[PDB]
Amino acid sequence: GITKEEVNSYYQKAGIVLTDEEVDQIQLMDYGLGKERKVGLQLFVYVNTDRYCSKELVLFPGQTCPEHRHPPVDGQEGKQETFRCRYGKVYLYVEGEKTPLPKVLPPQEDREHYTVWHEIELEPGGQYTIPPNTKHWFQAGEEGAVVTEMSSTSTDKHDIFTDPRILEHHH
Amino acid sequence: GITKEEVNSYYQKAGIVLTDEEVDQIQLMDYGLGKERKVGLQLFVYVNTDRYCSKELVLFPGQTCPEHRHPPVDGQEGKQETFRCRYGKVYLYVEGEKTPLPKVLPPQEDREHYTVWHEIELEPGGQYTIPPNTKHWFQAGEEGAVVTEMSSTSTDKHDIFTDPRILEHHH
Numbered sequence: 001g002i003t004k005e006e007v008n009s010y011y012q013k014a015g016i017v018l019t020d021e022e023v024d025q026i027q028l029m030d031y032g033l034g035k036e037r038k039v040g041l042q043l044f045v046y047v048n049t050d051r052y053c054s055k056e057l058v059l060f061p062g063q064t065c066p067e068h069r070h071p072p073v074d075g076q077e078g079k080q081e082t083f084r085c086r087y088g089k090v091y092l093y094v095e096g097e098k099t100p101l102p103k104v105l106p107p108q109e110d111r112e113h114y115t116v117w118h119e120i121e122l123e124p125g126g127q128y129t130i131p132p133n134t135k136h137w138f139q140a141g142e143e144g145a146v147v148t149e150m151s152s153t154s155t156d157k158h159d160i161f162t163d164p165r166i167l168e169h170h171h
Numbered sequence: 172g173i174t175k176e177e178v179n180s181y182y183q184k185a186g187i188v189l190t191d192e193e194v195d196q197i198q199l200m201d202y203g204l205g206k207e208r209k210v211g212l213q214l215f216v217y218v219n220t221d222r223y224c225s226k227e228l229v230l231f232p233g234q235t236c237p238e239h240r241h242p243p244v245d246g247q248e249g250k251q252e253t254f255r256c257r258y259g260k261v262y263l264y265v266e267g268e269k270t271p272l273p274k275v276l277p278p279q280e281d282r283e284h285y286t287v288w289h290e291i292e293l294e295p296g297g298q299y300t301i302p303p304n305t306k307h308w309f310q311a312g313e314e315g316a317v318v319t320e321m322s323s324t325s326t327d328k329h330d331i332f333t334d335p336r337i338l339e340h341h342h
């Protein structure tokens with residue numbers, strides 16, 4: 001199974017230093033789907049204030065983060081988040097015109113729970129800003145990925161997942 | 172003289188990848204003081220939206236960023252900013268009780284224009300959040316430093332420098 005130490009090995013690939021205490025604060029998400037290396041996300045929250053947040057994400061090789069959106073909370077538009085690939089490769093899919101031939105697909109057994117198909121390919125240095133309240137999902141290439149998130153305040157509990165099988169306590 | 176390529180060499184020390192286009196967007200600040208390697212700052216802005224901002228800062232060995240504060244703009248408290256050392260060492264001085272014996276001092280010829288003395292020493296992985304509208308300055312150790320800034324929206328032009336000799340067009 002996935003461990004926090006294994007996630008930290010990817011931070012180290014990217015040259016990103018966490019203290020021992022911080023490694024213990026890494027979050028492992030499997031979304032209750034029982035297939036963590038295929039569908040899951042791992043992250044470390046640097047900071048989350050009433051105005052801004054940053055996280056360092058790790059995806060293992062071929063791992064997919066399932067489709068979700070960040071809805072308005074407290075009268076704003078929803079979380080806007082900027083994703084910057086630090087290591088590896090990530091295929092990000094966002095609302096927009098469907099890419100006719102995508103480079104990767106979500107897991108076949110869950111595919112009906114993915115609805116957006118506009119492809120953004122990110123290698124290290126690549127960056128993209130996902131607009132508030134828009135559906136998105138992403139999958140790492142065969143070396144995995146480390147991705148920085150820079151955003152407005154995060155409230156994971158309000159995130160809305162396309163797959164109805166994914167519950168609030170899963171985020 | 173300092174060049175953008177030289178600044179990028181420090182990003183590379185920290186494992187941080189910028190594209191060629193991004194290297195060209197690095198900002199070099201000397202604050203009009205004519206001693207860039209002693210008093211100055213270099214940075215790359217990843218993103219700056221109406222809600223959040225992130226920058227990657229470089230300080231050369233022994234270089235000091237002069238004292239300033241981020242005042243309220245638009246009815247909020249002022250920019251709150253989280254500083255995380257990625258490489259090297261930085262000595263950060265913030266409002267608070269004066270550290271009786273600091274590890275470093277600002278340039279002797281400008282020292283009267285530094286007024287806060289509460290010392291925070293950061294090595295890689297170290298992080299500190301500078302509260303809104305509070306004076307702060309910082310200086311790298313003998314290997315220099317790379318420091319990530321994560322903050323609310325940045326508006327450099329409204330920053331207030333303690334040294335009256337530093338002008339608006341210098342930031």
Ligand SMILES: [As]
Pocket residue numbers: none
């Ligand atoms: As997320």
Ligand SMILES: [As]
Pocket residue numbers: none
């Ligand atoms: As700054």
Ligand SMILES: [Zn+2]
Pocket residue numbers: 068070081136
């Ligand atoms: Zn998201």
Ligand SMILES: [Zn+2]
Pocket residue numbers: 239241252307
């Ligand atoms: Zn500042």
